[PDB]
Amino acid sequence: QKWKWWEEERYPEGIKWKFLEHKGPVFAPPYEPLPENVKFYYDGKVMKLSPKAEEVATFFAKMLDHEYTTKEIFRKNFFKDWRKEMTNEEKNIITNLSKCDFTQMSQYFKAQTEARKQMSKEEKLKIKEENEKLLKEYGFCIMDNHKERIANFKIEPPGLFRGRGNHPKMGMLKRRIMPEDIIINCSKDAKVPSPPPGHKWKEVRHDNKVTWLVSWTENIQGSIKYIMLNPSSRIKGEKDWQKYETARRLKKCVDKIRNQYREDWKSKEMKVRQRAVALYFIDKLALRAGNEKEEGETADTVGCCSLRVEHINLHPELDGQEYVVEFDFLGKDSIRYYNKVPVEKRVFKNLQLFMENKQPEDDLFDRLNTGILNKHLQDLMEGLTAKVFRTYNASITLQQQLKELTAPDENIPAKILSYNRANRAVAILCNHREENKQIALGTSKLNYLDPRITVAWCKKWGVPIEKIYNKTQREKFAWAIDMADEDYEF
DNA sequence: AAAAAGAC
C-alpha cells in the first residue's frame, strides 16, 4: 500500500474514522446433503434423516476419530443439541446415539477429501483464481481514504464448538448465522451492502466510535463476534503502536511504583496488602490479569487476582532456597502454570496470612478483583493496567539481550542465531525442530515486544530486516520499520 | 454497586 498513516495526523480520540464502506459478509456456503450411496445406519438400520439433522450429524461424523468425540461431557452436549435439530419421528427413534453409526459418513468425507487431494491442477486452478476473485470484491472495505484488507469476510460456519480444556460447553452445536442475525457498521453516505435476496439485516448503524465493520452475537457463550480490519491497517496498528508507547512510559514511572507496593506489604488495610502482592506476582511472574469467570458456562481457569488458595503451597526452605511459593494452576486455555518461586519474606508471610482460615476453594486474594487492581494502577498512571506489565518486561528484558549476547565483529548468519538466542531468555519467565518441539513460535513476538527494538538493532548492525521478519509480518510492522533508527531505545 | 453488553 505504501501508506504511512503514522506520518499522518492524530485522530481526535473515540473517533475511529470519517468514512467506511464494505460489501457485507460472506455467509457460510449452504449444506448440500449426502447422496443415497452415502447413508447413515443406527442399529444397522440404515435410515435417512432430516437435512438439518443430517448436516448436524455430519459434524460429529467429521470428528469420531478426534478425542473430543471420545470426551464424555462433550458427547452429552452433542446428543441433546442434536435432538433439537431434527423431527419428532427421528427424535423418537434415536433414543440412543450409543447405537448410531457415523463410520460410513466419516468415510465419505475422508474420501471426498483424498478426492479433493487428487483434484486436477487445472480443475482446482479454476477455483484457486475463482476464490481469489472473492477477495477483490469482498476483502477490502473503504475507510477514510484507503482500501485496506479485512480480517475475514467469511462468516463463522455453523458447527460444533470446540472448547479448550474441560469446557462445560464443549460439544454444543454452534449455528448458521443469518442476515437477520447481522449488524452492519457503515457510515451514512457510504454504499450500504444490500442484504441477500428475501432476507434483511438484523440492524445497521454507523458508530464511527468503533472498529468492526460487521458483527453478530455468537449463540454458545451468547457472546458478540465481529469482522474488523487487518493488522497492517492503520486502525488496527495505531492502537498496537501506541500500545507499546504505554509500556514505554511505565518504564520510567515504575521503580517508584515498585517501592509503593513493597512498602504496601506492611500496610494495615488487608486489601491494600492483597493488592500489592498480586502486583508483585504479576510484576515478576508476569501473571495475567485474572478476570472473574462465571462458574459454569466457563472453563475453570484462574489468574493472579482470580487465584484460589489450593493453587499454592508455601515452603520456608526448599530446593536450597527459603520462603518458596509453589505455583500450580491452569491459566488461559487451561494451560497449567507450575512453578517454584522464592519471594520476599513479607510476601511469603503475607501470603501465609492470606491463607489463614480459608478453604481450598476459597479465593486466595479475597477482598480483591481485577477491576480494583486496575483502578489502583490507573491512579498511579493513566491507562495503567495489569496487561501493560507483561508487555513491559517482555520488550525490555529483550532490549538488553541484543545488547549483551550480540557480538560487534559477528557475521550476519551468526548474528541471526545470536538474535534468536536473545528471545529464548525472554520467554524464560512467561513459562510459555530438535531441541525445540514443545515451545511455540512467535507468540511473544506475535504481539508482546516492541518491534521498533528489533528494527533499530537491525540498523545498528546492518541486518536485512527481511531475515527476521517476512513480508506478512513486516507488513504489520510497516511503520516501525520506516519510522526507526538504530538509535532507538524503547 | 452491579450485572450486562461490548470491544479489541
Added chain:
DNA sequence: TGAAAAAT
C-alpha cells in the same frame, strides 16, 4: 494465543 490446515 492454540489447534489445524496449507503451502531420502
Added chain:
DNA sequence: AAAAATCAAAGCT
C-alpha cells in the same frame, strides 16, 4: 516420484 520435515477460542437494570 514420494515422503518427510518446516480460524476462532479465551482474556478492559
